[PDB]
Amino acid sequence: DGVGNASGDWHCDSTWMGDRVVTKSTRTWVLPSYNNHQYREIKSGSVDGSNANAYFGYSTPWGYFDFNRFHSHWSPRDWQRLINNYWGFRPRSLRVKIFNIQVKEVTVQDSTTTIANNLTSTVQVFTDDDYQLPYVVGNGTEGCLPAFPPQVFTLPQYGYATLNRDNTENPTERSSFFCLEYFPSKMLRTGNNFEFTYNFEEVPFHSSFAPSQNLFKLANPLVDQYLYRFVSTNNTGGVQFNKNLAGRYANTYKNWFPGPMGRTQGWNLGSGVNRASVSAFATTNRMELEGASYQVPPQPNGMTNNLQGSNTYALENTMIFNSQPANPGTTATYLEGNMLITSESETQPVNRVAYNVGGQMATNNQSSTTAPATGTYNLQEIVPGSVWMERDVYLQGPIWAKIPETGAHFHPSPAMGGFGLKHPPPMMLIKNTPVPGNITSFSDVPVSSFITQYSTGQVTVEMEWELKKENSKRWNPEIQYTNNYNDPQFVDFAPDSTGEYRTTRPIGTRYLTRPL
Amino acid sequence: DGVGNASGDWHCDSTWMGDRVVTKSTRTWVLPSYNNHQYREIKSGSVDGSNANAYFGYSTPWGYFDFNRFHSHWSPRDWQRLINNYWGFRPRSLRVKIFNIQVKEVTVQDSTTTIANNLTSTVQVFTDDDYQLPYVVGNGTEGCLPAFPPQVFTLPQYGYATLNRDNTENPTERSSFFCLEYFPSKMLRTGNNFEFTYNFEEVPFHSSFAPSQNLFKLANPLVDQYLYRFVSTNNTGGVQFNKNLAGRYANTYKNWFPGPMGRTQGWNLGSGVNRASVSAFATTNRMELEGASYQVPPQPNGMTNNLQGSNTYALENTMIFNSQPANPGTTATYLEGNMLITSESETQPVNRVAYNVGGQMATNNQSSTTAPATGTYNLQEIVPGSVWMERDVYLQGPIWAKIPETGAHFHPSPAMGGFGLKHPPPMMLIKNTPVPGNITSFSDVPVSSFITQYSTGQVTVEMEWELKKENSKRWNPEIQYTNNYNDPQFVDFAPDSTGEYRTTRPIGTRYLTRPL
Amino acid sequence: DGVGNASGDWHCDSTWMGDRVVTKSTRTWVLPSYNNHQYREIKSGSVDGSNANAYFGYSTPWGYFDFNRFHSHWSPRDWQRLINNYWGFRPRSLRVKIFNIQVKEVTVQDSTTTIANNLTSTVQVFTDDDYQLPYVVGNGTEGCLPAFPPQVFTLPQYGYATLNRDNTENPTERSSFFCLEYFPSKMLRTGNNFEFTYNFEEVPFHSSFAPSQNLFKLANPLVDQYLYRFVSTNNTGGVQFNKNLAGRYANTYKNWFPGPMGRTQGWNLGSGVNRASVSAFATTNRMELEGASYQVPPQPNGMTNNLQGSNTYALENTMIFNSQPANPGTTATYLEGNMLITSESETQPVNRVAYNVGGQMATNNQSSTTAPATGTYNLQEIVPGSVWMERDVYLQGPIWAKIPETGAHFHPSPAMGGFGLKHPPPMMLIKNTPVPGNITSFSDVPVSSFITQYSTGQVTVEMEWELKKENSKRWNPEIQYTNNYNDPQFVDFAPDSTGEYRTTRPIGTRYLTRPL
């Protein structure tokens, strides 16, 4: 339309309408001109003594919008309203809007650096709707819409790794290059706006409740089982049985089993002595792939990293966030006091404890001459009639992940939590259209001098979520997420005296309970 | 209606109508007044040297109807008619009826103990249709409708365990209390009756056939494979191949694999020496959960506990029933002569043997200096292209189990056999409405003196089952379940001279065969 | 619309149409960027030796429009036309418009500080229609549309106090943070405008008349009462009566009583000696709240601060304005010559005098041995059959106050005068949308460098008022507000030689009289 008319309005809200809730968020973004308008091939060799660190890829001059964190859509208080009242939820639709664009030209003649706005410049924008480009959004990386609405953010630069050859920096004949200018995009001048809608594919509700019963003790403690059990042999070797009594859960027959587990190492937070001067890496859990060794946090779903009322944590089975945002490439050594360490202790009635052995079993064949022997195991995968709880979602965590296209997968639920999607919300890429400097003669060699500039604008995301109403018959009152602080020095989830947003705790999702 | 009119009739039957069969059972039940009308919080610490035995829960004054045993619906002879002719079956619907109620008041003045009937007293009854209460029915516990129709049974008391804290008797802030009087129930006087219907959710047919072929020998024994195999290296290290010949099953290429296995210990029944003076517990298979060690019979599906024509049994992978019903809390040491030990030997062509190693595999990397080494394994979970047979159903065993609500499970088929249901037949609870004794003054303190009483009545269950017709082209005659006894001293599955029902053998379900 | 077209026109007017009068005001406002775009948590401890001064709250980067002063809508001359002719009035509707916006960018490179206009920048605007935010408008604070139409004003910064803990600067777990960007707002570029309408809820007319009779002397001075009164006891103790004569008002029986009073201290203005070297604070009237002592001017309604034709003023029961506007945070010691001290002397026939005792009453029980004793009181609250006059409204005073939501209040009429409203004219907030400076690299840390800028525009308020026509039968002429000055050196309510607006007197509202 025009220069003196606004292309959209500010919307931040939450509208609860029974079975649905609609969240809206608007933020102000700024977009730098990345790479100075060109593609570069980026690469690395073996860094920090690990060739799993090697890669080969491309950085592009595009930036993208990333809103795959819950705090980008939920306020602390609406999150509390959700986890204290519902049993589950899932995303239904998405609507995005980019508007009020402003391109600024920057000129640094004689160290004066003046910023003027360029009314005729454009930004290009497109969404990759067929998933033809490497999807980098759901991998726990930075650059999402901020938690707090008044914050202004920088869009991150799009880049991707393709195939490297033999754990070195070199490409292979299969490494691909994707040119993003090879997709159709819209061009927007200062009076233009971009709009985009999306519907999620039917996914299972997240389970925002904790189990009120232990999986191995579902039998009625008042009645005995009509099943018996082998309990020994007499002085001659003949077998003897005993009836499974009422409430002797250590012996009853079971119908269901706990989920898969792979033992992780346990460390003590706060009080609780640990081995001094250790170097985690050398002894962490790894998986090999293409000849290299990778750490695999947070480990696959089906375990619990903490046992309620204990300070031992299987740290690599844990999501660890920082209480605040950090600068790029920081190598500082943070301590427990700076972190937001999550705990999955409310799944312990169903998920095995990560730092303990998973059980034991027969190692030999007993005979008149050999005594029965058993041996414990450290890992155990899926068996039939197995049940576990998926990892929890936090307000500061990720909403979805793309399920990789390979044609074969098992139980597509991402290790970091959230929804696993075949076709997730498409990537939205954006860049400042290049504007050439003063060029006076002809050359077949591509132009390399540009006017420096950047853009800024507003972005609105509108998500509809479907809720699963809590339907309990528990008599006594439940546990609820509550604002409880002893002698607060500042309000949590609010700006402090400096104006910086504070958050002292990770807020999970399981407060309500249910009988198994 | 009224005192002198009966509220229902007696129905026991079986109606076969092609693809369906409808069973009806009526029994006479008696209901004691449990706990003297009050809820109690029950609990236990570490019993028998195992804190997996600890719990915290509640007993209620309610009793419930449990008809989750096949012999509650099938006569020995109809069961035989089913397993000798069909390939499978599954439950379709359920209809329950409680009628002809009679409340009796018991007065023990001067050691005379007279029983009179109280025409104005009620029983309360309800079904938990939304599964809001801890479901205790499918956990192999006692108190089901009896096998034999003339038997009168006592309804069991409803109780449940909730969460205990740290393997001790104490509750946690998440432990829940469920008050059952907090549901809507019907009240029945002597002229009233209760009726309830239910439809099962589409489940897979049980497979009542044994495989006529071994899974590893599905190739035609007359033709060779067009695939080759590595057979050695020559004096220089160069690799050599050999064609896979006709009928050399030890080498053919396979497409499918046997199901998951976890080695269990094997013991000899009858003839066959075992290690003398053993104490099973210390070396049985265990799974850890919340810091405690639990035995897990019958182990997960996918194994066979016995090898046909052998007396070695992997006893913990076995369902062991008693030939007769036992008294509550018996600590007697039964011998093989008293038991009904089931055998899954007819799945051996597809399921690995529980007391043997599961296979072996590469442990190193061979080179000119090291010889290839291999190591056996004792457990192996699911892999792709795995096939196994679920555990069999017995006439004296369980029909269904509730699949626990956790949001994540794999292959919901219960270890003890039967159908795994998301929404199983709802629990039916019943209790004698309390009647206060002589109270002459007012008190804010709840009444604690009641008239003692009990009730009795009839209960009819009507189930429709769908059958899968056997469609074989086998030429020679099949194996059938048959009444074969050498010199019977009494008729089996009949009352003896005392009037007590006899059953000398577990009747499984696989007699018919099928080619894989 | 566009850059070269104006978004609205200038309207200043007054249209009298019988029973209604419509006022319109347009002003030019300027809006600074407050706090540099961020929220800050502001707080204070015990200041000036009083912990009632402690608080905890938040300043925001928003500013707001405040038109809750009568002089924002009335000219001195229309005010005179209102108070000389009507008996009352009340507000009926409100219409607001913000237009002709202009955002200016300010750059201070090399001490040149140049101001350019930025055609693409926005201001955000919204009205809090559900009263979800702390309402700070009706609390006698600065920043309203100016009295004189040519004046340009700065919008004040929105801030609020929430709960502090124990009269200290610390918050409590109940202290709330309100993010204003969490409401939906409009964005306006230089061609846009915002419009908003509101209807007041039916309120009682203000009473702009003075009583022509004294409340205790409503009886006809020509007739005696048919009631008698106790006047003494004879030498034996027997009681004696006397008839209440005609016009002896000191004794008649009364039907109605004066309003509530709490004694305030009286000081002499002009001529009239006061105690020398006093420090008011230590002896002013206070109310305790949460453990702290607060001064409570102007005291609750129902008293008169001055007795007509006297120079004694109960200064804390008085509204004291300054003859001119002052700078922020001035600690100057003003003298009577600089003030506009209001007087409520025209309510004296009905309201008790604040610096005098309120009356007296029985303190003992007389008997043959004790003489009747009495004791005066300093405070007396509401009794049944009590009548008083509310405080007057001045041209330089406040129009409305929000009645606090607590569920319980008595006679919601604000101490400072005006209308008390359940749902008052919603707050209108406005801010300059932030525009980021030159950002060249990505960071997850929020942007903190902005282009400095400010905005300006016009604002039009249109209020409809309903009038109550004066309907007197007084014969002789009334008192009227009149422009009377002996030897004027300058015209009052006009700009002086410097161009600054002068106002030498507070203009109340009661000139007309009425018989009680």
Author numbering:
A (entry chain A), B (entry chain A), C (entry chain A): 209 to 724
Which passages does the manuscript contain on this structure?
Adeno-Associated Virus (AAV) is a small (~25 nm diameter) non-enveloped single-stranded DNA virus in the Parvoviridae family (genus Dependoparvovirus). These proteins (named VP1, VP2 and VP3) share an open reading frame and differ only in their N-terminal residues. We use a high resolution (2.5 Å) cryo-EM structure to analyze details of the molecular interactions that are presumed to be key to efficient infection and are likely to be relevant to serotype-specific tissue tropism.
However, in the receptor bound reconstruction, a PKD domain of AAVR was bound, at its C-terminal end, on the side of each three-fold AAV5 proximal spike. The resolution of the reconstruction is sufficient to distinguish side chains that identify the domain as PKD1. PKD1 binds to AAV5 near the 3-fold symmetry axis spike, primarily to two of the variable regions (VR) in the AAV sequence that have previously been highlighted, namely VR-VII and a segment containing VR-IX. AAVR R353, extends from the end of PKD1 into a polar pocket between the AAV5 VR-VII and VR-IX loops. Similarly, AAVR H351 interacts with a charged region of the AAV5 surface. Instead they involve hydrophobic contacts formed by AAVR L376 and AAV5 Y542, L543 and A540.
